[PDB]
Amino acid sequence: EIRSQTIKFAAANSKGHPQVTGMEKFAELVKEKSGGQINVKLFPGGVLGSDPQTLSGLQGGVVEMTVMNAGILSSTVKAFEAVDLPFLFNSGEEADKVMDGPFGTNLMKRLPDTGLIGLAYWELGFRNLTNNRHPVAKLEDIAGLKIRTLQSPVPVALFNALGANAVPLPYTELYTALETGTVDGQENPNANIINAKFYEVQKYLTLTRHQYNPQIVMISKKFWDRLNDEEKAVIEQAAVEARDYQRKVSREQDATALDEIKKTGMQVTELTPEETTRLRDAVKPIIDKFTAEIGAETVDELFAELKKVRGENAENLYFQ
Template sequence: MKRMFIKTLVAAVALAAFGGAYAQTKTIKFANQNAKGHPIILGMEKFAEIVEAKSGGKMKVNVFPGGALGSDQANVSALQGGTLEMASMNSGIFANVVKDFAIYDFPFLFGNPKEADAVVDGPFGKSLHAKLEEKGMHGLAYYELGFRQITNSKRPITKVEDIAGLKLRVIPNPINVDWVSALGANPTPMPFPELYAALEQKAVDGQENPYATINGAKFYEVQKHLAITNHQYNPQSVVISKKFWDSLSADEKKIVQDAATESAKYQREQSRSAAAGILDNLKKNGMQVTELPPAEVAKLREKMAPVIAKHSASVGDATVKAVMAELDKVRK
């Protein structure tokens, strides 16, 4: 009888231990709009690899590319509600919940990747992510989408006037609608997963995105002309649901934060090293590429200046001054 009791006790302890280990296993859904193989997805896959290694398999990350879990706007709602654990998206999209994030969509804010890195990795970038806390999200790091270019199916763009009249898809937020309007084009806000079909059906003439996104989404199949404008640089916020973040232990939080930081460095390296090869691939797939000369870029800046002034007022002087102070440091 005693032996039977001991066996039962041992079995119960083992079961409890197994159940406890199972309960500690956490699964993270990590969403993004870009196609598999895109530098953003490579960064997310590196994050998954690091988290699983550092946690000894107790934390598992499932990466969902291609808008599989809905649009960016749907992902924001899911993060806030705790039904989605993580997402990476254009930082400017968060302007819908924290107005300061609109600064990241200012045309010609960053002149090169070094300037962008200094801002997003420094006090300014961290302070903006901190403002997401009260909106149900926690910012971990910044990936990059990169510098945006304009494509269309109608005509080559060799001067600013060539943009006028084009119906261009834009990220659904006010500053993007305004700068496209300022160029005499017709802005059409639209979630990214709907874009390819809209281009194919000629519902819109064109769009604007970095090389890697144009290539990954195979827009070369439905767009003939690409103009190198570098009119906007997109940092990508790597964000975790605050509900999920608060459920993690201190050790688990460190694993997730360290993995986000490490994968951000890896992701930017992948993005930048691949850019030239991706542009070559777009050309091989039939895209006709033009580059605006300096005089036309100056005209582009001039036309966008009133848009920047308008949105500087809505974003707030303190935010604009803070980002410009960071940029002044790196430019000196």
């Protein structure tokens, strides 16, 4: 039977953010399905530590649950670097198909040996590109731009392949570096433009969608192994039901963010799928260098899923 359980569920963001809205839905569903036997206590705002710190806390059994960008796992299970590869998805719908299918599922199968159990993928969002020099609509427009990027190997390779300087800078210093102009631009989700007021110091946004950040919801294997099947089923049901809700909330908020961004007088540029393909093809010979460490098994499967979803895109039937 479902016994009294307590689950501490930690994350980086705060109440109001789609991540925490998803966590609240998860907690409520678990409370309902368990008739109050399983209580999920939220630790938002990074109060328990960074995402990498909390990851090791799950492994040790100190914190039961967390949700974080799945690419963070790569130093635990290298195959997860696949989720950081560029230009995989053009929409949330495409991302869901691939993350919820064999690609995402086979990644999660690699977790138990490391002391982690994967429950579901939720959404953080696409990474896009702002700058203050000129609109970016194609590769040549990126040439020479000094762009603050994440500093793990994939984004550094990506932005160098695009002709940019992939500049290291602590996030807290970024607004002011953009203001003074020593950095031309930055790459991040749209929400950051509003939250950090980058619209005050950046005139241009391109929806490059150069990477997509899925989040993975995980539970400590040490804790999971002590649960019975009925308790596990409650948690699984709640994770996948909360997933669909969280993604809807995320996408509603992103639409509103973009409304707000446009009203600040930033110029927003979209890429056609064919321009995205042009960028993808230009960076492929560089990005292929990660395939050996990710593994052909994982990369080949991913590439097949992407060919499939790209063929389902209605744009293929727009003109002929």
